[PDB]
RNA sequence: CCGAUAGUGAACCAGUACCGUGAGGGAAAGGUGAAAAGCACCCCGGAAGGGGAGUGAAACAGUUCCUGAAACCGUGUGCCUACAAGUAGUUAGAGCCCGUUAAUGGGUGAUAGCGUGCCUUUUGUAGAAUGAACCGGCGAGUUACGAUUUGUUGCAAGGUUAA
RNA sequence: UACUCGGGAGUCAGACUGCGAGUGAUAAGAUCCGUAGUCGAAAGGGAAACAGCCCAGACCACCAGUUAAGGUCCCCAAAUA
RNA sequence: AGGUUCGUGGUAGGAGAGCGUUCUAAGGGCGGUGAAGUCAGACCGGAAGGACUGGUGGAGCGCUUAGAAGUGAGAAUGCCG
């Protein structure tokens, strides 16, 4: 019958800038993933993109409660026999905070083609100034 | 009317897969260039396709009164025909089948 | 009676049952015989007593 | 009298092969695989005919929740207030109001807030 | 101006001049049907029912009595020699909305 | 009673061809048209084979020639497709292309949710248990005489004939 | 609902779970009995995936509503109660 | 014929109602202004199934009521092409 479905390009997508100072990693990532997915609008449609674009600054000051800064381990395998690598959450917050935020958030998006397409809308900076001043980005305050 | 002519060679002793590799070269080309292409392609199916093409051009000029210089090859395809079944004696007193295949060759020429 | 409207007495004739014509009739694959016995074989069964 | 099997088998098999039109490869040409494809398609349709209602209710609930969060309410609080006030509009129509006539949705949310606090 | 009415066990949104399909109703072609269960009247005056508004009703005219397209309900169980086939056709009634009160 | 996988093994030069030292075993193969009127003549080619012309009701009936299904092999085009982990579908669904036995129509489908073939045998099989390359035809509870039980019909302390 | 009379069968390889015992080592997805359930012959929801565990028994259609086990930060519907 | 109440998962298996194929008998039909067969469609019935229209085909075939069976195939390392 009659139920509204959006169309590609129908819904206006905005740009948001978020400060990541002192917020826990997962608690920031959940909010950002919900924003990206498009679940904050009454025009949500499961099979198309209606989410917004997110810019994250001060990524080097993300929080890690407990002792996660020294024994939260990230693994990679090169598919060669005995090719496992490990890295702590610390020294990954200091060297490559962008990878930390990116993979933490990527673990929360849907695991399909639309999720990969959504991940391309996330820009994260470890400093304080972004390169996208030409867009308009507006400040967003986490719930 | 009758702007096209065709010729067919039926039940020619040549496997269809070996003629459908030469006849793909001359599709949609001028008749002079197609004859030249068939002349310099050293396969075994070139003389047969060339003969069929020249017959098609000849009966396009004679019956329907068209111009040789203004012709192109519209359609060209190879269709299957009856196969002859033969045998080849393998080792240890048993034989294996051999398929001597034939084909039908068709070419259609027309005004540009 | 007219030969084009013959009607035998109701209840006096019935339809034969045919086994082994598909599973929709309830007498399909095994045809009312069960599974893998002596009584499930062609010409099977034992003497009367 | 002999009854030779003509015209009846092909007529029945062609119906299935026609029902399997649009499938990949031999699934739309050969009877044996087309029969399995048709049975599986019927079973899938039977099951999805029940899952469709569940999916649409989930979609309506998500849209209503998203629209209500903009009025400082959850979905849970809004539905409780609507049930407490005495309003019997289902999720489909609330979602419609949320998508288009948002003014009316905000009026209903005001009614729910009035009943909830009260 | 639109309204939300309840009919056939489910609610439907209507407007003047709109054509709707509902569950089978008692009435011949050309008759007039009145829906007295109105839940919400909107447009420049948002007055809601608790659960029904008031003596406000909706009137409509019958256009056609018929049945929908044919389904085919099929069930089977692998390896158990069980199949079941059955066709369905759902009756309906087609109306045209006249006025909203 | 059968109607060319049927009916004799054999509807056709069949106990033939073929197999075996021998006794012996043992096939496949029907249909132009009412009438050969079976394509004079012209063109390409060595020929085969084609394109015209002609006979014919029909040649898309041209010497396995009535009808001509499926597997299988091709030519053209409307929609989709080179960042994507797929028992291949089903439900939701935009875009593009059409226009029906006219009715809440047809074709293709970017994207999203769900989803481990069919049969047999098993306590239990998606099963790394078994069977099937695909398509077509053929292929399995029958008849005779007795026993017993239910239904129908005729007569009824009688009923009924066999040769 | 029982029972009696008559026509027709199939079945006699069972499986796991809770409780009570034996053999075993107070082992086994072991083996053998008593008792109740489910599977066999049962789809649907939860245990990630899952015959036997927990909830619950599919006549057909609906873009309607209330609940059971289990759950409400994101994948993923609902409390960053 | 109309109601009230209770029901309608299902393997082995029991009971009931039917669809379709070939032939026979009677009645009534259509067909060179085109039969059977074959091809394509978005039609009809609760299922097996049945029509209508158009192309090819070029001479036989339905319908109603009964009767008789060489009576319906996807599987047998099934037989033939
Ligand atoms: Mg040998
Ligand atoms: Mg030798
Ligand atoms: Mg019967
Ligand atoms: Mg049964
Ligand atoms: Mg079977
Ligand atoms: Mg068996
Ligand atoms: Mg037995
Ligand atoms: Mg006969
Ligand atoms: Mg057959
Ligand atoms: Mg498709
Ligand atoms: Mg024949
Ligand atoms: Mg014979
Ligand atoms: Mg000899
Ligand atoms: Mg003759
Ligand atoms: Mg000649
Ligand atoms: Mg000639
Ligand atoms: Mg001619
Ligand atoms: Mg003539
Ligand atoms: Mg004839
Ligand atoms: Mg022929
Ligand atoms: Mg064909
Ligand atoms: Mg990538
Ligand atoms: Mg791409
Ligand atoms: Mg999909
Ligand atoms: Mg075993
Ligand atoms: Mg495998
Ligand atoms: Mg075996
Ligand atoms: Mg095998
Ligand atoms: Mg008597
Ligand atoms: Mg008994
Ligand atoms: Mg015993
Ligand atoms: Mg035992
Ligand atoms: Mg036991
Ligand atoms: Mg134990
Ligand atoms: Mg055990
Ligand atoms: Mg069993
Ligand atoms: Mg279950
Ligand atoms: Mg389950
Ligand atoms: Mg587990
Ligand atoms: Mg099973
Ligand atoms: Mg959620
Ligand atoms: Mg039942
Ligand atoms: Mg039930
Ligand atoms: Mg029975
Ligand atoms: Mg006529
Ligand atoms: Mg005429
Ligand atoms: Mg006949
Ligand atoms: Mg016809
Ligand atoms: Mg009939
Ligand atoms: Mg038979
Ligand atoms: Mg076969
Ligand atoms: Mg073979």
Automatic annotation (TrEMBL), chain B:
Q: Does the keyword Acetylation apply?
A: no
Which InterPro entries has this protein been placed in?
A: Ribosomal_uL22, Ribosomal_uL22_bac/chlpt-type, Ribosomal_uL22_bac/org-type, Ribosomal_uL22_CS, Ribosomal_uL22_sf
Which PROSITE patterns does this entry report, sorted A to Z? RIBOSOMAL_L22
Keyword annotations from UniProtKB, A to Z = Ribonucleoprotein, Ribosomal protein, RNA-binding, rRNA-binding
Highest taxon, organism lineage: Bacteria
Q: Which GO terms describe its cellular component?
A: cytosolic large ribosomal subunit
Task: Name one molecular function that GO assigns to this entry.
Answer: structural constituent of ribosome
Q: Which Pfam families match?
A: Ribosomal_L22
Which GO biological process categories is it annotated with?
translation
Record text on subunit structure and interactions: Part of the 50S ribosomal subunit.
The text of the family note is: Belongs to the universal ribosomal protein uL22 family.
Q: What functional role does this protein have? A: The globular domain of the protein is located near the polypeptide exit tunnel on the outside of the subunit, while an extended beta-hairpin is found that lines the wall of the exit tunnel in the center of the 70S ribosome.
Which protein is depicted? Large ribosomal subunit protein uL22
Organism from which the protein derives: Listeria innocua
Gene assigned in the entry: rplV
UniProtKB/TrEMBL annotation, chain C:
Q: How is this protein named in the record?
A: Large ribosomal subunit protein uL15
Bias kind Basic and acidic residues: ranges: 1-18
Q: Transmembrane segments in this chain: where?
A: none
Q: Which domain of life is it from?
A: Bacteria
Q: What is the role of this chain? A: Binds to the 23S rRNA.
Locate the compositionally biased regions of type Gly residues.
Answer: 21-31
Q: What is known about its subunit structure?
A: Part of the 50S ribosomal subunit.
Write the lineage as a comma-separated list. Bacteria, Bacillati, Bacillota, Bacilli, Bacillales
Q: Where is the signal peptide?
A: none
**What is the scientific name of the source organism?**
Listeria innocua
Task: Cite the residue spans of the region called Disordered.
Answer: 1-49
Of the parent protein, the shown chain spans: 1 to 49 of 146
| UniProt similarity note | Belongs to the universal ribosomal protein uL15 family.
- Look up the coiled coil feature and give its residue ranges: none
UniProtKB/TrEMBL annotation, chain D:
Keywords per UniProt: Ribonucleoprotein, Ribosomal protein, RNA-binding, rRNA-binding
> Which GO terms fall under biological process for this protein?
ribosomal large subunit assembly; translation
Nucleotidyltransferase among the record's keywords?
A: no
Cross-referenced Pfam families, in alphabetical order? Ribosomal_L20
Q: Which GO molecular-function terms appear in the entry?
A: rRNA binding; structural constituent of ribosome
Can you tell which superkingdom this protein's organism belongs to?
Bacteria
Keyword check for RNA-binding, yes or no: yes
Give the PROSITE patterns listed for this entry: RIBOSOMAL_L20
> Any coiled-coil ranges, and where?
none
Question: Cellular component terms, GO, for this chain's entry?
Answer: ribonucleoprotein complex; ribosome
The UniProt family comment states: Belongs to the bacterial ribosomal protein bL20 family.
PANTHER family tied to this protein: 39S RIBOSOMAL PROTEIN L20 (PTHR10986)
Role of this protein: Binds directly to 23S ribosomal RNA and is necessary for the in vitro assembly process of the 50S ribosomal subunit. It is not involved in the protein synthesizing functions of that subunit.
Q: Protein name, please? A: Large ribosomal subunit protein bL20
From TrEMBL, chain E:
What are the annotated GO cellular component locations?
A: cytoplasm; ribonucleoprotein complex; ribosome
Can you provide one Gene Ontology molecular function annotated for this UniProt record? rRNA binding
Concerning InterPro entries, the annotation shows: bL21-like, bL21-like_sf, Ribosomal_bL21, Ribosomal_bL21_CS
The protein's matches in SUPFAM superfamilies, at most eight in alphabetical order, are given as:
L21p-like
Q: What does this protein do?
A: This protein binds to 23S rRNA in the presence of protein L20.
> Which protein family is named in the record?
Belongs to the bacterial ribosomal protein bL21 family.
Q: What is this protein called?
A: Large ribosomal subunit protein bL21
Q: Which organism is it from?
A: Listeria innocua
- Gene symbol of the encoding locus: rplU
